[PDB]
Amino acid sequence: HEIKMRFDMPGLSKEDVKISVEDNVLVIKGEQKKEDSDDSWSGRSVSSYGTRLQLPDNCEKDKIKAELKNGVLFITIPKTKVERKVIDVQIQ
Amino acid sequence: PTPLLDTINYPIHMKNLSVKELKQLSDELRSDVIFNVSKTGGHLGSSLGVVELTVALHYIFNTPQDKILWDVGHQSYPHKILTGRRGKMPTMRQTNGLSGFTKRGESEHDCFGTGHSSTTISAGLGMAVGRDLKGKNNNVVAVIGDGAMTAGQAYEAMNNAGYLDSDMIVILNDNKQVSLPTATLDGPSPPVGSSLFEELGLYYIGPVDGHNIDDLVAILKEVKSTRTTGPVLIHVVTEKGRGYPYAERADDKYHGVVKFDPATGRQFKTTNKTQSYTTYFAEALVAEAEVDKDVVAIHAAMGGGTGLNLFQRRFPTRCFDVGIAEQHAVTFAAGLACEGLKPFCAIYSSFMQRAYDQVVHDVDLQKLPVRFAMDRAGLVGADGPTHCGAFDVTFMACLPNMIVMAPSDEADLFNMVATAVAIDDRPSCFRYPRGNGIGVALPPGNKGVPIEIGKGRILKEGERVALLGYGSAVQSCLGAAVMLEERGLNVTVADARFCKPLDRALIRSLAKSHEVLITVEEGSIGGFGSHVVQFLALDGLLDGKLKWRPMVLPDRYIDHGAPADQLAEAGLMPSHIAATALNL
Amino acid sequence: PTPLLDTINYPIHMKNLSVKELKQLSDELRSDVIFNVSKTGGHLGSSLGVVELTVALHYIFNTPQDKILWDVGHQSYPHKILTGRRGKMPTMRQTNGLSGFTKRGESEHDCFGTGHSSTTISAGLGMAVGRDLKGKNNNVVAVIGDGAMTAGQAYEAMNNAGYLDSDMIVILNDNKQVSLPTATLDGPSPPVGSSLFEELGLYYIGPVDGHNIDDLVAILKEVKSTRTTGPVLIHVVTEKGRGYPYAERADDKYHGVVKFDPATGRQFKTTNKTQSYTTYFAEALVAEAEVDKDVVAIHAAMGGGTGLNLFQRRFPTRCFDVGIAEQHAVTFAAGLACEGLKPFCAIYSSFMQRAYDQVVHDVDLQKLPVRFAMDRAGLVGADGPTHCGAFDVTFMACLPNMIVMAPSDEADLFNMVATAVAIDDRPSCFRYPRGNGIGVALPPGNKGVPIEIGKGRILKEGERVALLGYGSAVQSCLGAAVMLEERGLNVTVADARFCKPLDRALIRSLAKSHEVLITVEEGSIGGFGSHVVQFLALDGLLDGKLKWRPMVLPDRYIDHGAPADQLAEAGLMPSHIAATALNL
């Protein structure tokens, strides 16, 4: 249904976190690398991952709520229904 | 008031119907389900909210073209109606009649016999890849509720599905998080109040409203012919109890509703003479929870079915809700049992096997202090063998470090809880049936007297022939003498409540005293009869040469129906027990 | 080359150390673990990547102040080192020595004895709420790998944790999705290639690099003293096999590495005379997979430990990877078994109980055609009772509709696979031990001859005394005669490979012919001995009055160590079996 995601991640690393909320695609690059500044702490924690949130309804733009880019990434964007609903992939 | 429904006996009849008449048909379905359930024992509120869906996925997808999969099967009432089983509802849940859940071995459209939560989406994925391996091009739909979203099988299978990209369908239910539970949940704890399953890899439509058949028909025909690629999951908004203004605010209060007044919801209050064991348990556990600090009970959403609501709001911090995940509980028990606490589990005799791993490894290898309350022992009565927990004496009592106890009445029920809450050097387990007895009051009225671990209990005097057993069985053993006691009391009855460690002293005394012995139990043959003869064998060097025949659950699955005839079917009405000795 | 490590025998020693020297210490740990494992049987690559973490969570959190929880226990080598068990590594995995996994009943810091995947985070949550209930203010850490992230207990327990907001710690491992498996996985299928479990309610830090102890120490001290509120989960990047340039590209190839050359990785090729049963199985199943269309094998990531890699890449679409979730498999079996297929499960005798629900309900109530390959029967040898699957004959053989079979050698192994792939009217199961025999070649070399369902097999001639049994046991029964055969062959041996349906004809013939009988099995007492006497009892009316003593796994958990002495410990070296009849 509608699209939502929060990132608890206390001390969300400032290496690479991204948000893009279109129709049924969504890229939510939530990431906790800690590769040099853990939160502000000494650590060579080489890491690699980002987050993906596709959506099984073309995410329309009725209500959007966002709180992010420092320690959380949190987004809520809507739709409901039909015309080829798939999440995490649209396989052929 | 059901015009359209007297015409349909399979979905081919309704294939050309229109949505406007589809809604009226769904309403007729609500009414027919209400009139049918008002006969007996129907898990109402779910199916009441489910009528809509049943309509949709019988209209769009053809069966047995498309292998549809429902949840546990409680909300299978509309499905059965629309699958050539409307005229059999006055016989559902009865003997020789319909099971209260989908049962594969009944009709060509009975796709996969459910009866345990979350045990379906895995089989649905299985059918999906299998049909893609036979080249066939079908659709496979798995319908479940949030009640099946908690357990493990659901999570693991759905992740693996999203991995395999096997073309399949999943259907989630109950947006408002009111669950879809096990059969005999009388009532869960009432609450006062997006599901990202993309990390599980599937496609997640819904929760759409499961209260306008227009919506669903404009979905499964519109996108989800085999053109669909990979797995899809369908959450649905469903007001459980929809269509019956009493249950509409009293769903759990009419979920497992007994034959009720279709006009007021009135149910039978005649059971107020003797209470159920499940009540006889939470009534009593508080008598140990008040006098003790760390007595905690553990349950997997079987509160009403275990009466433990007598325990929860009394001690709002010594009763825990884990959802329906018997595995996560039995360690969350042990995980507390290592804090010196005494956390004790109430979980149905059948529903334990859901967690038989942890009972074997995470407890008995740790010897942690966890007491188990195996509710619904053996013959559950009118819910089919998909709850016949007649293995508890088998899979538990084989473990070292575990103590197995089963009552005879409400007294012995709590005469032992005073023990299994007393001991915390190791784990133990309670095997109490579902039914009634003769119960003296609380340890106030002297019932909380702990008894020696591993001590039996002779309940009758009889020397030409012996008799043993426990669980509901010793009452039947009492009842076994009814055609026996008038024979000079050939029979003695010994409720050797301890299955392991056995009252090795009692059985030994029993052995040489009599010339014959007959155990009995409400379990398959891997339990008491096994252990007793295993002990009889080694002790046998003092002439383990007495005839011994364990009248256990015969090697078969006893169906739903009247418990009395289940005894008669399973060969456990007293006469069967009686006849056994009569041959000797 | 280990300066700092000869100084530490508990974390209090290293409390004041600095990160620069912490790294050197971790390196010394890599080297010491390599030199220790080069003695025997160490699950290397994980612990190699885990050294870093072990350091961090022994430095920051104090024990038994903070109840730390590891995964299955394979990567517990560094932990044991830093917990007063560095000097015992030359005795780990041996008799009387250390277990290869964390074992609560050993040391004050042995927090909760693991041995099965995902069975920990639940107990960690349990300890968390328990300590919050005793008023104590500690930290509880659960370390697991992605290998434990797949199963059910993990998902359910972690959801329930995120619900309860109980202050606790979780630690995930292996960012690159190489798993943390069961003990005896010789090799998984090599892949060529995040969680956001905040929806489950947790807090999810990582995967950070588990290759700079600086990183982790700047985390657990910096945020995760008890000031942390609720549960937290710690994924970690760990190159399994880190620190050993051979396993660094050959982790699974040195994961369960036997005593190897610390300079080249050389291992013992001496086993090339007779192959293991697990090889003797996937070698052979292909001889039925080539001649048949829908023969499919099912495994929960026990490929190498089941040899089924001989099956996977040969038939890239008839061998399936389900992760380590024995539940999701056994129905994904049945879910395929309803498509008329013949999907057949290879799952360890102990690891079955993880799924004993579905075997009871989702199969035997459906009578679906699923054949089980219970690998690692009973005494697993050098991995402790946390794999002693000596219950398979108990929990399975009690079910109606299920056929129980166990081999004697490679011949009978596949003489029966020709049966249990032939029959598909119902389910069946294979109980084969781990070890060796005397194996004639494939059905090419005449070993795939199916045998009558429920037909036993007399293997020796002997009339004063009988003998039975199956699994590895009949070889020992053969071996039982070694001190017996020279007594006029009092002994006959009957590998009655069918446990249910029993060869009721054979046992009957055996009964009256001899004056004594002795069964034997590699299972706890709820199995063959139980069923045989259950059948002996009812058939007993033809004088079931012959002495009978089931030498089964005694009621105890047999530890890790040498399989031969495990037989000696469990009373199963031939002399024990021998002595039994000798009393008569």
Numbering used by the authors:
A (entry chain 12): 136 to 227
B (entry chain 11), C (entry chain 13): 73 to 265, 318 to 708
Question: What's the publication's text?
Answer:
Here we succeed in obtaining the Hsp21-DXPS complex by co-expression of both Hsp21 and DXPS in E. coli at 37 °C under conditions that promote thermally induced aggregation of DXPS and soluble complex formation, and determining its structure by cryo-EM. Surprisingly, the Hsp21-DXPS structure enabled unambiguous identification of only one Hsp21 monomer bound to DXPS. Hsp21 binds across the dimer interface of DXPS in an asymmetric fashion and is perched atop the domains I of both monomers, forming a crown-shaped structure. At least three intermolecular contacts contributing to the Hsp21-DXPS interaction are revealed from the structure. The first interface lies between the β5-β7 loop connecting β5 and β7 strands of the ACD of Hsp21 and residues 335–348 within domain I of one DXPS monomer containing an α-helix. The second interface involves the interaction of the CTR of Hsp21 with a surface patch on domain I near the dimer interface on the opposite DXPS monomer. The final interface is defined by the interaction between the hydrophobic groove of the ACD of Hsp21 and residues 318–322 within the mobile loops of the DXPS. Consistent with this notion, the segment 247–274 directly connecting to the mobile loops also undergo structural arrangement as a result of Hsp21 binding, thereby converting one active site from a closed to an open conformation. The map permitted the construction of a model of the ACD with seven β strands (denoted as β2- β9, with β6 missing in our structure), in striking contrast to the six-stranded ACD structure identified in the Hsp21-DXPS complex, suggesting that the ACD partly unfolds to peel away the first β strand (β2) during its interaction with DXPS. Overall, the structure shows that Hsp21 sequesters DXPS in its near-native conformation and specifically binds to and stabilizes the dimer interface of DXPS.
